[PDB]
Each structure stands twice: as C-alpha cells, then as structure tokens.
Design an enzyme around this catalytic site. Structure first.
Site, PDB file in Angstrom:
ATOM      1  N   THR C   1      30.176  32.921  -0.407  1.00 18.94           N
ATOM      2  CA  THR C   1      30.947  31.685  -0.737  1.00 18.94           C
ATOM      3  C   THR C   1      32.437  32.023  -0.812  1.00 18.94           C
ATOM      4  O   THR C   1      32.891  32.591  -1.828  1.00 18.94           O
ATOM      5  CB  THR C   1      30.381  31.187  -2.058  1.00 18.94           C
ATOM      6  OG1 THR C   1      29.029  30.775  -1.890  1.00 18.94           O
ATOM      7  CG2 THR C   1      31.237  29.960  -2.488  1.00 18.94           C
ATOM      8  N   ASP C  17      32.828  28.132   4.314  1.00 20.60           N
ATOM      9  CA  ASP C  17      31.493  28.218   4.964  1.00 20.60           C
ATOM     10  C   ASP C  17      30.622  27.435   4.004  1.00 20.60           C
ATOM     11  O   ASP C  17      30.986  27.052   2.897  1.00 20.60           O
ATOM     12  CB  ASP C  17      31.040  29.694   5.163  1.00 20.60           C
ATOM     13  CG  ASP C  17      31.162  30.548   3.886  1.00 20.60           C
ATOM     14  OD1 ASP C  17      30.469  30.175   2.899  1.00 20.60           O
ATOM     15  OD2 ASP C  17      32.117  31.374   3.839  1.00 20.60           O
ATOM     16  N   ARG C  19      27.133  27.960   3.156  1.00 21.08           N
ATOM     17  CA  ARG C  19      25.890  28.478   2.584  1.00 21.08           C
ATOM     18  C   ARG C  19      25.963  28.442   1.059  1.00 21.08           C
ATOM     19  O   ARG C  19      26.922  28.922   0.525  1.00 21.08           O
ATOM     20  CB  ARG C  19      25.604  29.905   2.963  1.00 21.08           C
ATOM     21  CG  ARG C  19      24.428  30.602   2.273  1.00 21.08           C
ATOM     22  CD  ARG C  19      24.064  31.942   2.871  1.00 21.08           C
ATOM     23  NE  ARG C  19      23.456  31.621   4.304  1.00 21.08           N
ATOM     24  CZ  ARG C  19      22.571  32.485   4.870  1.00 21.08           C
ATOM     25  NH1 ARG C  19      22.124  33.596   4.262  1.00 21.08           N
ATOM     26  NH2 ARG C  19      22.190  32.166   6.193  1.00 21.08           N
ATOM     27  N   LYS C  33      30.992  22.344   0.708  1.00 18.77           N
ATOM     28  CA  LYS C  33      31.686  22.774  -0.452  1.00 18.77           C
ATOM     29  C   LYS C  33      33.122  22.224  -0.455  1.00 18.77           C
ATOM     30  O   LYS C  33      33.860  22.440  -1.397  1.00 18.77           O
ATOM     31  CB  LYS C  33      31.805  24.318  -0.488  1.00 18.77           C
ATOM     32  CG  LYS C  33      30.496  25.051  -0.175  1.00 18.77           C
ATOM     33  CD  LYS C  33      30.515  26.484  -0.540  1.00 18.77           C
ATOM     34  CE  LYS C  33      29.147  27.084  -0.339  1.00 18.77           C
ATOM     35  NZ  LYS C  33      28.062  26.425  -1.037  1.00 18.77           N
ATOM     36  N   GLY C  47      32.981  29.955  -6.981  1.00 17.23           N
ATOM     37  CA  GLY C  47      32.537  30.066  -8.374  1.00 17.23           C
ATOM     38  C   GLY C  47      31.234  29.400  -8.504  1.00 17.23           C
ATOM     39  O   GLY C  47      30.565  29.233  -7.463  1.00 17.23           O
ATOM     40  N   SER C 129      33.707  34.958  -3.619  1.00 16.86           N
ATOM     41  CA  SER C 129      33.117  36.263  -3.723  1.00 16.86           C
ATOM     42  C   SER C 129      33.405  37.032  -2.472  1.00 16.86           C
ATOM     43  O   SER C 129      33.519  38.250  -2.562  1.00 16.86           O
ATOM     44  CB  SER C 129      31.598  36.126  -3.899  1.00 16.86           C
ATOM     45  OG  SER C 129      30.890  35.406  -2.844  1.00 16.86           O
ATOM     46  N   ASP C 166      30.077  39.843   3.633  1.00 19.82           N
ATOM     47  CA  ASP C 166      29.721  39.248   2.391  1.00 19.82           C
ATOM     48  C   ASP C 166      28.291  38.902   2.588  1.00 19.82           C
ATOM     49  O   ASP C 166      27.726  38.884   3.674  1.00 19.82           O
ATOM     50  CB  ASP C 166      30.602  38.069   2.061  1.00 19.82           C
ATOM     51  CG  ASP C 166      30.469  37.641   0.619  1.00 19.82           C
ATOM     52  OD1 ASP C 166      30.438  36.398   0.416  1.00 19.82           O
ATOM     53  OD2 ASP C 166      30.359  38.511  -0.327  1.00 19.82           O
ATOM     54  N   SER C 169      27.979  34.617   2.006  1.00 17.42           N
ATOM     55  CA  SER C 169      28.387  33.891   3.189  1.00 17.42           C
ATOM     56  C   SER C 169      27.244  33.826   4.134  1.00 17.42           C
ATOM     57  O   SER C 169      26.246  34.497   4.007  1.00 17.42           O
ATOM     58  CB  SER C 169      29.670  34.515   3.710  1.00 17.42           C
ATOM     59  OG  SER C 169      30.788  34.317   2.824  1.00 17.42           O
TER      60      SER C 169
END
Lengths: 245, 249, 226, 50, 244, 217, 241
Positions: C1, C17, C19, C33, C47, C129, C166, C169
């Site tokens: 994320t 993205d 996910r 998002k 977050g 993240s 990541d 992601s």
C-alpha cells in the site's frame, strides 16, 4: 402609539431610544462632582467627597479605587454599582496580566469595560448601570483619559467631568485647555484640579466637602497610581482658597 | 439571561394558532415565485428586487442549492431564508450523508425542514419563520416532485403552484395552462409567461433568476471517469442563456 | 500500500495501487484507495484502511458545507487545517496517513499528513509501507519542469517498481491527473502489469454432488397482497 | 346581480353603435366587459372605497 | 421583565379548567374529518382532506395516513406539523419495544405512551399543547383489532367506531344507527364512504378528496396486512359502492 | 470568433461600398467557415473549445440570412438554413427560428416558397420541441394560406387555433386568431360572420398585455 | 399590547421591534459614501466631534477588522464597538480553522446570521447599526457589502448611509448611468479619494476640513486610515481640480 417602552430596555421606544438607559443618565445626575485633568505626563483625578454628617471618619472613605497598579478609576452616581464596575475590570485586567505579562493598555482596558456596560443593555433581565466613571492612567503608549457614560459609550478626553456640578466643571475645564493648549505640567495640574472642584462646589454650596486628589504620572510617580497626600495636598487646598477669595 | 422558555405561539380563543396565521401574512408581502413540474424536470422562478440600482444582482442569491439534486426558492422574508437554507444543507449532510453516505431523497429532506419549521412554531423565545419555500427536487423512486413547505410546518406535494404577492392571479393562469405531458423546455415557457404578468418593473435575464432541475450535466461534475456518479442535476441559468428564452415569448 | 504525489507545472498527479491486505491474507485484489475530498481535491489513503476511509468521508461533508456557505471555490489548505485539528484531538489513535493533492484558485498544492497531525510540504511526497521502494526510482528521474505526459509516467513507474519491492503492493496502478483550469482525469487502471495465470484445470462439479438434509422457501421478495 | 349588469351593459352598446334593438353581438361585448370588471376587483382585492 | 410577557398557558380558570387545552380542541374542529370503524375482520380508516386543488398532487399524498409500525397505522386530524413530530416519536418507541422484548408491541402500550406525551405539555413546561387527534387502528393477538381516539388533553378512550375532526356531532350520529356487531370489512367500506358523503362540503364526494386504507386479517396465511389504497383503487371501490 | 466576425462585417460593408456581387463571395466564405468550425474541422481560428464560441457564431448566422438583400441564391439557402437550426439544439434554437421566418415572409421570394419553409418548421415542432412554438407557427402558416388565396386551407388552421385558445383564453394570441378570422371572412365575401369574430377580438384585446401593433391593425 | 414589545409578528406580518432599530441608525447624524475604485475601495465618512474636550484621535467610525476588511459604522457608538468586537473575533476564528485570512464575502454573511438570530430571540436586542465592509478580495476584487439590523445584506457598486444618504444615492446613480461602467475607474487610489471627496462636497452642500474627514481605503493586502495631516494633502488636491 402603543403603551410599554419604559418597563424594559430591549425594547426600543417608537423613536429608537432607550429607557431604561436614558433614565439611567438621570441616576448619574445626582452624583458627586468628579473631574479628570489630562496633563502631558499622566492624569490627575479629583473628586468632591461630601462630609454629609459630622459623624463620618475623615480621610478613611474613598471613591477612587486603583485597578492594577497604574489605572485609577473614579465614578459618580450609584456608589455600590460603581464599585462593581471597577471590580469587573480588576478581574479582566488580572486575566490580561497573566496571559500577556504586561500591564493592560488604557485603550485595551477601555475596550474591556465598555463591552461590559453594553452587555447589560442587551438583556431584559439585567439592570443597566447608573454610574459614569472617569478612568485613565499611564501605560507604555503614553497617558490617556476616558469617560465612560452609563450608556456604554466612552471616548477620549482632555478633561471630563460627571455629577451635579458637571455644568460648572465642563465650562471650567474649557478655560484650562485654552490657558495651556500646548500642554501642562502634572505637578501643576494638582493645583488646578483643586481650583475646579471648589468652583464646582457652588451647585452644592449648602454643605462642606473633603477634596480627594490622586495622580498617575510618569515623571513624579514613575507611572504608578498613588494618592496626593501630605504637604502637597495641603498646598492645593491653600491654592483653592486664595482663588475662590 | 434566558427566562424565555414559554411559547409565544399560543392557541387563540376561537381556535387557530395566531403566530402561524400572522406569519403567513408576512409570506404574501414578499416577491412572487412559482414552480412547474414537467415529466423530466422541474423549473423554479423568481424576480430580483433591490433597494436602488446601486445594488448588484450578480452577488445576490434567492435560489439556492441544498443538495445537487434538490433546490429551493422562497417567497417571504430575506433574513429568514438566509439562515434556513443553511440549516437545510446542514441536516441533509448530518443525517443522511454520514449515515447512508449519499444525498437524501426529496420526500425525506422536505420532512426534515418541516421539523425545523415546527421547532420555531414551538419552544420559547422564538416566532415562526416568515417564508414559505418551494423545495423542488428529484429522487429515484418518487420521480420529479415539487413541494411547498409553509409557516405551519405542513408540506403538500404539488404539480404546479405559486406563492408570494401575486399568488392568487398566478395559479389560475397555471391551472388552465397545465397539461399532463410537458417537456422541461415546454415547462419553461409557462413559468416565464406567468412571471412576466407579475413583474411590472424591468424584465431581463439579469432580474429573473431561473433554475432548472433538468437532467444530468457532466460538465458541472468537476471530474470525469467515475461513471457511477452523474453531475449536478441542479443548474442555475446564467443571464445570457435566460435572455434567449425571454425573446422566445 | 503506497501513494505517490508528484507536483508539476500545470497541475499535480497522484497515483496509488489497488491492493488491500488484512495482514498476510490479500483481502481484495482491487480496492480504490483514491478518495474524493472535493471535485478538484482527490486524496489517497495509506496506513490503516478502516481509519482512512472514515475521516476522508467526515471532512468530505465538512469541506462541502464550507464551500457552499462561503459561496466560493474551496482551498486545499482548508481540507488540511480541518484534518490536522481532527487527528490531534484523539492524539494519534486514528491512523490516517494521507497524501492530499488538489488544485484551487492559488495554483496547485500537494501535501502530506501523518497520524499525529504532522504536515510537510513537498514537490515529491511519499507515504505508506512501499514508500521506501517508490522513493528510490523517483529520486533518480525527477527534475524541475514536468508536463502531464512526463509526470503521469513518472508517478506510474514509481508505483510500478514499488510493487515488486513491497509485498503489500500488487494489482493495477491507478492514476488521477488534476490540471489547472481543467476537470480532473481519473484514469482507473492506467497500467495493468499483473494478470492471473489461466488455470490448467476446471473444477465445475456436477449437479447433486452435495447432499441436502432438507430445504424450504422463504418469500421476502414481495410483501403479500390481500 | 352580475346577470342584471350584463343586460344593462348590452343596452348601453345598442346606444354605442346606434342600433335600434339589442343584438346577440351586444351580449358578447357585455359578458366580456362585466366579467373583466368583476374579476379584477376580486383578484386585486380593491373596493369602491377610497 | 420576562414575567411581564408570560402567557400562563397552564394555570386553571375559575371553572377548574384549562383554557388552552379547550382552545386546542376548537381548532381541531376546523381540521379534516377522519372516521375509523372497527369491523370484526378489519379496521377501515378513511379521512377527507381539508384542502383540495386540482394542481395539488394528491396521487402519492399520505398526509392523513401514517404507519407507526407494521401492525398499527393512525389517521391524523389537527395541526399536522405537531403531529409529524409525535408520529416520528411513536415510530421510534414502537421499534424500541420490539428491540428490547422481541415481541410485537400491543396497541395499548403505544397509545398510552403517545397520550402521556401530550399530557406532559398541559402539565408543565409553560409551552402550548400539541393539538393532534389520532385515531389508532392496530392489531395485537391478545384483544384482536383494537380501536382508539386520543385528544390534546392526553387521554385515550376505546371505540368500536369513532369520528374526530370537522362535523363530529353529525358523523357520530350516523355511525350509530347503522352500526351492527356483525359486519365484515365490506359493510365497513360502505359505511366509511357513506358518512363522509353526509358531512361533506363539496357538491359531490370524489376520490381525490378521500384518503383510505384498511388492515385485514383476510390477507394470506392468517397475517395482518396494512394496505393504504392508491387513489386509483379508491376510485374503483367508489364505483362499486355507487357513490359516484 | 475572430475570423467569423471579419467575414460578416466585410460582406455587408462591400454591399454598400463596391458591389453586392463582390460581397456575396464573402458571405459564401463565412458560411463554409461556420459549418466546419462546428464539428471541429477548422477549429474556430482563434483557438479554444466550442463553449461560448458556438453561441456567438449562431447570432451572426442569423445576420447572414436575409440581410444581404434579395437574390435567387439567398432564396434557395432558406430551405436549408432550417437544417442548421435543428442542429444547434440549445436555448437559441427557437430565437433564431422566429426572427428568420419573419424576415423570410417580409422579402417576397414567392408565396409558394414561404409556405414550404413554414410547413417544415411546424412539422419539426410537431415532434418533440414546444407546443408553444408549434401553435405560434400555426398562426403564421395560416397567414400564408390567406396570401395564397386558398381561403379554405387558412380556415382549417383558424378554426383549429381557436378551439385550442378557448382552453387557453385571455391570451393575446387569441386576439390574432380572431383578427385573421375576420380577414378570411371578408374575402369569402359574407360580412355577417366577419363582424361576429371582429366583435370577439375587441373584447379580448382590452388586456393591457396587448402591444401597440395589435390595436393599430 | 405585546406584539410590538418583543420581536413577534403583528396582524400585518411586520416586526415593528425590528423596524425601530432602523429608526435609531440615523440619530447620530454621521454620513458615509463608499465607492469601488479600479483596484481599491475608498470610503470616506464624516467625523463629527462636538465638544472641544474630546480628544479627536480617539473619535472614529472606521474600525480595522482585518488586514483586508475594514468596517464603517453608522448608528450609535455602543452598538458599533459590540458589532466591531464580534467581527474581529470571527475573523480570527476563521483564520484558525480554515488557514487563510478571511474573505469579506464570508464575514458579510457571518454578521448577517447573528443579526437574524437577534430578531428571532426574545431576550436579544437587535444591534441598530448599519455596517459597510469594504475590501479588496483576490477572487472577487474590490467589493462593498452592507449589512443592516434585520439581517439582510447585498453587494454594492457604492452605497451611502446616514440620514442625508437619499441625496448621496442620487449623485452616485447618475454617475454610473452616464459613464456606463458599474465601478469607478482610476488606477491610483489617491485620486479615487479626490473624486469621492468632490461627490460628498456636492451632495451635502458643505465643505470639509481635515478634522471633519476620516478616510479609510482598502488597497491590496492592507487597510490603513489616513492621518488628518495626510488628508489635507488631499484637500489641497481638490483645489487644482
């Protein structure tokens, strides 16, 4: 026209006036003479304090109360009501002193009381004040002098007056400002406050009176409000006698 | 302080509620406003009025958007409309845009502003609001719908109606010119025609504030590319655009 | 994320993205998002998911009210000032980490906010993240002066390589481009790099493989007539 | 009352045109004029008192 | 002084009596007529609008019929604004008793709660009454169909048949001469149209001035079904009874 | 915006400067430009999207037609000018159409031809659009059947218009129907019924919503 | 007996109590004339100072409410300071919760609502002042908004207040008819002060000396009041007109 219009004060009368507050200027009219001479370096308050009986204790009653250490406040009209207005501005001033750690400016303080008297005229449930005050002092921006009408009106002043002898006072302060339109001394102005209390005692020449004088001055008192007492007070007294002779 | 906790709307002795009766006098003093419900839109209309020509009409508003799907237009007092428009936007967000995530249907929002009415026909220290609103809108299940919210706090669904000082003459004109198919463009020709007979002062595209609740414009949406949402249905008509339809009489 | 924001001359581009993860398990393959505070102010959230959606909603209302009571277009700085105040009074309990981008009457703006109610400015901002991964590609390839064809690439590449560095992601890279004087262009699924590999075996069962202990009918489609 | 006003008003148009009898067209002029006069004062809520 | 402008809405007169509750009832005698008849197989509720106009949308109006809960609908006659509030209270309270006891609220409970609310305002607060009169049609297992009228005084009385609003004396007398104990909803449909026809102030009674709803146990599976008739079925049932 | 103005201004100028033969090529050029600009094929020659720009363009296409002065070609354009009217499809569709019919009638290009154009307009207005536009056109169509001296055809619209404005009474458009009715019945030459309908016009023009023009005629 | 003694309606639909405020406004005899220049707004007003003993510096009816918003007060001076305090306060609050300095448009509507509530109480006296808020906005340019004790307000091309304002309204209206441009144009603010002073000398039929004028001008990003020393340099500038 309709009947009403004098039982409250958040009525307006059909002419846009008040009642109570217009009636309140007559409450102030019965009061003791009280003058203020704005000198260049400060203010001099002086007030006729009647000895109404021979059973009063001389020089132990006062109507000149200090607010903070540098603003004298002096009132006429309803005397208990008048202490309450000074009392509100000692709380307000003290709040200002904590928050910003400087003595509340005279224009700031004028603003703070002003609202207060105006606030009591906005409700039908609180009685409008029947006092007029003369207050001022010395702060960092110079000397200033204010009169606050019972209407919650106040303005700048070079001389102001209140009570019964307001007719003689107003006329006698025009003369002093035409003697010295370029300014006058604060030492000197003690003696002139004496002279214009004794000429204004002629609406009230029935009785006998104690003159109380105070000053807040930058160059003799260091800008702190103190009482005019001792020898200086007796010189002013002797001055007034010789003038009225 | 406050000691006014007693109602100043009280029952009158031969019946009726005296403040609400009086307040309806104050409605019929003000400007004239009307609404025509078509089969695909609602049109609402009012006349601007100033103290002098020195006032601007450009910054003035009398037709407001409460939600993008529901507009309002009043006849009565200027002051009371001004606060009540703002309380209408407020309850519309707080009680359906935080709870069901979207703007409320027209029946529901009308019902909330009648309850705003109601709590100044009652409680202490308050008199009734002095407006009567048309609150026209579009919801997805009762169609186009026009309402009249009043000083009583009632609502009536309407198909065309008028309020304000020329109300009596206006609605008779509108009773005879109504038809059970109108297009929104055909609706406009009725509303303008009627509002011309209630004006006697100047007539312009700057002095008639006209609003349509037509059909969806994606040019006022502000964005493109979520096809789930479809732009303001409410669309206030600019002075230039209104002026052509004035010549069209 | 991860969320990127890249401020350029003519507007501002913001990309993220799709996910959603609820721990190790991947809760949703696509979730949007990118949130809409107003028509010209999109934000996105990183977050915790449950905490972002809920306060970009709450102030969505509050800023809209504001915009109608002033009768004038919203400023970006307003959305951010109401948001900073709203997070600080709970003292960082509600985990919001937003990158709020927006055009208004005073040029373009791009801001970041952190959960305690920290705010920083930046012409490149990074959050989430997979932040660390996205930062690395951005910082090689940025320079002053970008048009919209340039900028929209650069946001999309940083998110794309951000996917493979990541684990939170994945899926498609969405972009939203806010020009000055123009209605924002929500290009959902701008780059799709990942697609599910086509299964080598079907798994459709017969009818009646399963057993039925009993059954019956409930009718709640209607409410019955007289 | 109005009915009786449509008859007097029709007799007055017999004078206007200098006819010798009341014609049907005199009724068409009557009905319109009396109606425009009755409805104006109802809907404008104006009286004969000043 | 504030005391100067106080009404004193809520002292007694010398008679022992409450001017403002009496006056409230005065104004409900202006308002729209509503009659309710409790058959032995339903309750027919029918009310005639106090206003009418042909531009007025009257096809999806339901400004006299309001449903409180699934099994209890009321007819309204009075200050509609005041009623809208207590209808929305009622709806909160009815749903509440179901939330906490998981049991259909009895007719008796909801009716008594609404009464005491009216009652609070004539008792204290220095506020005007809520001038509302409700006729409650309701079903419970216990006592079958139950029929009820409430006044602004905040008092409730049972009925089998009752009429509130304009022309109360007239409507009440008519019901009594006709009413039998053996009546089903069909006889009730005919009587409700018919009393309304005698109190009417229009040259003929029509469907666009009638609002009309029933609650029948004769709906399928031994269930109570609330039906607020559409104006086009009302117009139909108006041809059956031969009123028009 | 820039080029459309230049061309219209220059074409009128040239009528009253050099020549109307010479001016006609300017108008021809202006015409091509408007069409092309409309469905993006030359832009507008000043940059920027259609927006306001197309609104401007239309008002001066209504200044292009029947304003250059009579001509066999100008005539022929009028059966096709009504195509651009159906295309613009905003507020001004009715505004352009109204002013155009009046101007086409004033210049006498042949009886025949006016009727053709009128009929096409009422027909267009027969589908969709406004009944207000339709019914207004009906009053003009009727006029042109009167000029033709087919007084049986005019009568048919007159009788139609009339029944309708007895459900839409107190109307200045019904003063027009009564007054036209009187004209036909003059020229069918019986004066009983000519008087009868004129009587109908005087009672119904006493509304203060009737212009200087109605009274004069 | 009680319908014109609290702000409830009358048998007429009028509120006389609200109306008496409008009859209190014009009892101070202070005039104001305010025009929107090209990129400034200039407001000029009288400053009556009756007695010798008033200190003239303190007598004012131009209140600084923000950097961009001044507020010019006609009506009694108690009501003036309470409307002025509430204004400064609301300006601070807006800055606080929305992060830009307050635009005038919004202060106009904000003091309007407070006016509206004051006539829907029974324990609040409507403040009897007409305030004119002059500004230079960065989105809507120089504006004038005038609020009044009822709670109505409208924008203005110019506006005037006081009891002789019927006269002033006449001069300004002619001026904007003849010219046919909604606002006065002239680039420098100094000279809009000159045009403005001429129009008050013509309308009231009185000349003005430096102590009788007190002038406020909102230019871009600043409001100042001209010292009485600087106002004379303008009075001389009318002598070469």
């Amino acid at each position: 026209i309709g009947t009403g219009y004098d039982l409250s004060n958040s009525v307006f009368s059909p002419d846009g006036r008040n009642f109570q507050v217009e009636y309140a200027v007559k409450a102030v009219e019965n009061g003791t003479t009280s003058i203020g001479i704005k000198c260049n370096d400060g203010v001099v308050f002086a007030v006729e304090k009647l000895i109404t009986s021979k059973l009063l204790v001389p020089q132990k009653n006062v109507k000149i109360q200090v607010v903070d250490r540098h603003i004298g406040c002096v009132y006429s009209g309803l005397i208990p009501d008048g202490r309450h207005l000074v009392n509100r501005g000692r709380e307000e001033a003290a709040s200002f002193k904590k928050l910003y750690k400087t003595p509340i400016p005279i224009p700031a303080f004028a603003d703070r009381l002003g609202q207060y008297v105006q606030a009591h005229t906005l409700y039908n449930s609180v009685r409008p004040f029947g006092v007029s005050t003369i207050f001022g002092g010395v702060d960092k921006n110079g000397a200033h002098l204010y009169m606050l009408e019972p209407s919650g009106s106040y303005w700048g002043y070079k001389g102001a007056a209140t009570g019964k002898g307001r007719q003689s006072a107003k006329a006698e302060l025009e003369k002093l400002v035409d003697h010295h339109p370029e300014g006058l001394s604060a030492r000197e102005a003690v003696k002139q406050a004496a002279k214009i209390i004794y000429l204004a005692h002629e609406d009230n020449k029935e009785k006998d009176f104690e003159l109380e004088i105070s000053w807040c001055s930058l160059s003799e008192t260091n800008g702190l409000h103190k009482f005019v007492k001792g020898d200086l007070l007796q010189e002013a007294i002797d001055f007034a006698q010789k003038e009225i002779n | 302080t406050d000691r006014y906790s007693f109602s100043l709307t009280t029952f009158s002795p031969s019946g009726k509620l005296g403040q609400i009766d009086y307040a309806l006098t104050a409605v019929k003093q003000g400007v004239t406003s009307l609404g025509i419900k078509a089969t695909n839109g609602v049109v609402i209309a009012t006349e601007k009025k100033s103290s002098s020509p020195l006032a601007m009409s450009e910054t003035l508003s009398k037709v407001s958007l409460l939600t993008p799907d529901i507009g309002a237009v009043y006849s009565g007092m200027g002051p009371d409309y001004r606060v009540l428009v703002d309380k209408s936007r407020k309850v519309a967000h707080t009680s359906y845009k935080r709870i069901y995530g979207e703007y409320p249907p027209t029946k529901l929002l009308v019902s909330e502003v009648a309850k705003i009415m109601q709590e100044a026909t009652q409680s202490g220290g308050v008199r009734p609001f002095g407006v009567s609103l048309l609150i026209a809108g579009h919801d997805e299940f009762n169609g186009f719908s026009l309402y009249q919210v009043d000083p009583s706090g009632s609502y009536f669904p309407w198909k065309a109606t008028a309020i304000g000082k020329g109300s009596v003459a206006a609605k008779t004109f509108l009773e005879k010119r109504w038809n059970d198919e109108l297009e929104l463009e055909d609706a406009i020709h009725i509303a303008l025609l009627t509002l011309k007979e209630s004006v006697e002062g100047e007539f312009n595209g700057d002095t008639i504030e006209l609003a349509i609740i037509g059909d969806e414009n994606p040019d006022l949406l502000g964005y493109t590319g979520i096809p789930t949402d479809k732009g303001p249905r409410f669309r206030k008509l600019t002075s230039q655009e209104i002026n052509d339809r004035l010549e069209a009489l | 994320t991860t969320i990127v924001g890249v401020k350029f001359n003519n507007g501002v581009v913001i990309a993220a993205d799709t996910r959603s993860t609820q721990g190790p398990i991947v809760a949703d393959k696509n979730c949007a998002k990118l949130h809409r505070i107003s028509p010209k102010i999109w934000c996105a959230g990183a977050g915790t998911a449950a905490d972002t959606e809920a306060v970009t909603q709450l102030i969505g209302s509050n800023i809209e009210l504001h915009s109608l009571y002033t009768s004038r277009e919203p400023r970006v700085v307003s959305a951010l000032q109401m948001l900073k105040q709203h997070l600080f009074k709970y003292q960082g309990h509600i985990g919001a980490y937003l990158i709020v981008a927006g055009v208004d009457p005073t040029g373009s703006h791009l801001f970041s906010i952190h959960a305690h109610g920290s705010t920083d400015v930046g012409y490149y901002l990074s959050l989430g993240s997979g932040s660390l991964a996205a930062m690395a590609v951005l910082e090689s390839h940025w320079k002053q002066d970008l048009t919209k064809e340039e900028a929209i690439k650069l946001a999309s590449d940083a998110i794309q390589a951000g996917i493979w560095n990541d684990l939170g992601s994945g899926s498609n890279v969405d972009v939203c481009v806010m020009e000055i004087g123009k209605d924002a262009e929500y290009l959902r699924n701008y780059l799709t790099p990942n697609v599910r590999e086509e299964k080598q075996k079907s798994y459709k069962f017969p009818r009646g493989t399963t057993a039925v202990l009993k059954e019956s009918i409930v009718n709640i489609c209607d409410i019955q007539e007289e | 009352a109005d009915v009786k006003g449509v008859c007097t008003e029709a007799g007055m148009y017999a004078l206007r045109e200098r006819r010798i009898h009341v014609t049907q067209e005199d009724f068409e002029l009557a009905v319109g004029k009396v109606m425009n006069k009755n409805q104006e004062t109802a809907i404008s809520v104006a009286k004969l008192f000043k | 002084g504030s005391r100067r402008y106080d009404s004193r809405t809520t002292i007694f007169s010398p008679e022992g009596r409450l001017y403002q509750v009496e006056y409230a009832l005065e104004s409900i005698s202006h308002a729209g007529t509503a009659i309710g008849i409790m058959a032995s197989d339903g309750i027919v509720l029918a009310a005639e609008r106090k206003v009418t106009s042909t531009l007025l949308e009257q096809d999806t109006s339901t400004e006299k019929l309001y449903k409180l809960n699934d099994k209890i609908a009321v007819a309204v006659a009075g200050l509609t604004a005041d009623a809208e509030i207590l209808i929305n209270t009622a709806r909160i309270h009815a749903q509440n008793y179901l939330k906490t006891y998981n049991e259909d609220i009895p007719v008796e409970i909801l009716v008594r709660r609404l009464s005491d609310i009216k009652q609070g305002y004539t008792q204290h607060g220095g506020l005007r009454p809520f001038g509302v009169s409700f006729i409650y049609a309701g079903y419970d297992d216990r006592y079958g169909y139950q029929l009820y009228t409430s006044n602004p005084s905040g008092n409730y009385t049972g009925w089998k048949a009752i009429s509130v609003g304009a022309n109360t004396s007239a409507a009440q007398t008519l019901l009594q001469m006709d009413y039998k104990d053996d009546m089903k909803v069909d006889d009730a449909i005919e009587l409700a149209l018919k009393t309304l026809s005698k109190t009417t102030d229009s040259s003929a009674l029509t469907y666009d001035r009638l609002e009309f709803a029933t609650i029948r146990k004769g709906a399928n599976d031994g269930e109570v079904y609330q039906k607020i008739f559409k104006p086009q079925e009302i117009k139909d049932i108006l041809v059956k009874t031969g009123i028009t | 915006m820039s080029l459309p103005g230049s061309k219209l201004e220059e074409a009128r100028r040239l009528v009253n400067e050099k020549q109307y033969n010479e001016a006609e090529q300017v108008y021809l050029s202006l015409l091509d430009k408007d069409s092309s600009q409309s469905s993006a094929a030359a832009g507008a020659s000043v940059d920027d999207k259609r927006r306001n720009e197309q609104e401007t363009s239309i008002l001066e296409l209504g200044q292009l037609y029947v304003t250059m002065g009579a001509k066999d070609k100008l005539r022929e354009f009028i059966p096709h000018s009504t195509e651009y009217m159906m295309q613009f499809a905003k507020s001004k569709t009715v505004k352009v159409l109204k002013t155009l019919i009046e101007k086409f009638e004033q210049v006498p290009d042949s009886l025949d031809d006016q009727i053709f154009v009128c009929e096409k307009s009422i027909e267009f207005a027969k589908r969709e659009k406004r009944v207000f536009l339709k019914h207004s056109l009906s009053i003009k169509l009727a006029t042109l059947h009167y000029q033709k001296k087919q007084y049986k055809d005019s009568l048919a619209l007159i009788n139609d218009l009339l029944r309708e404005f007895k459900k839409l009474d107190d109307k200045p458009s019904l003063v027009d129907v009564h007054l036209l009715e009187s004209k036909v019945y003059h020229k069918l030459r019986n004066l009983a019924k000519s008087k009868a309908s004129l009587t109908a016009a005087r009672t119904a023009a006493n509304s203060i919503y009737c212009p200087t023009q109605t009274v004069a005629e | 007996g009680y319908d014109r003694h609290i702000t409830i309606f009358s048998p007429e639909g009028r509120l006389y109590q609200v109306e008496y405020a409008f009859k209190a406004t014009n009892q101070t005899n202070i005039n104001s004339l305010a025009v929107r220049g090209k990129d400034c707004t200039v407001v000029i007003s009288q400053k009556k100072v009756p007695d010798k003993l008033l200190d003239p510096t303190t007598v004012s009816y131009i209140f600084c409410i923000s950097r961009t918003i001044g507020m010019v007060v006609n009506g009694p001076i108690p009501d003036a300071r309470n409307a002025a305090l509430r204004a400064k306060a609301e300006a601070a609050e807006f800055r606080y919760k929305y992060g830009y300095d307050m635009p005038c448009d919004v202060l106009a509507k904000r003091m309007a609502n407070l006016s509206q509530i004051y006539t829907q109480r029974a324990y609040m006296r409507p403040l009897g002042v007409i305030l004119t808020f002059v500004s230079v906005d960065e989105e809507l340019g120089p504006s004038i908004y005038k609020t009044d004790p009822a709670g109505y307000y409208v924008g203005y091309k110019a506006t005037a207040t006081g009891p002789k304002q019927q006269e002033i309204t006449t001069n300004l209206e002619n001026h904007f008819k003849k010219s046919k441009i909604d606002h006065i144009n002239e680039e420098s603010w100094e000279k809009v002060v000159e045009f403005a002073i001429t129009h008050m000398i013509d309308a009231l039929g009185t000349e003005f000396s430096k102590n009788d004028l007190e002038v406020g001008v909102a230019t871009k990003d600043k409001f100042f009041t001209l010292s009485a020393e600087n106002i004379e340099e303008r009075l001389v500038a009318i002598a070469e007109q």
